[PDB]
Amino acid sequence: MDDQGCPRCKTTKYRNPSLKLMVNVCGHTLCESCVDLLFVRGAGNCPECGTPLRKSNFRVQLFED
Numbered sequence: 167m168d169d170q171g172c173p174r175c176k177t178t179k180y181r182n183p184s185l186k187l188m189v190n191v192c193g194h195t196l197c198e199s200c201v202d203l204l205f206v207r208g209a210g211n212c213p214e215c216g217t218p219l220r221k222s223n224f225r226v227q228l229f230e231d
């Protein structure tokens with residue numbers, strides 16, 4: 167539930183033991199705390215390759231079972 171730790175707000179899953187990361191079109195990674203600060207401040211910019219997200223798009227998950 168931690169791994170390398172979120173990219174934008176690198177802190178959640180590593181500190182927070184109850185979240186998940188959502189991937190986007192290009193297929194990268196957006197922790198739960200990212201989709202919150204990534205869009206509230208712009209929305210449409212991958213947390214890493216800044217790909218021009220046609221419009222948000224973040225599939226979160228973690229359980230896997």
Ligand SMILES: [Zn+2]
Pocket residue numbers: 172173174175176177178196197198199200201
């Ligand atoms: Zn984050």
Ligand SMILES: [Zn+2]
Pocket residue numbers: 190192193194195212213214215216217
């Ligand atoms: Zn990307």
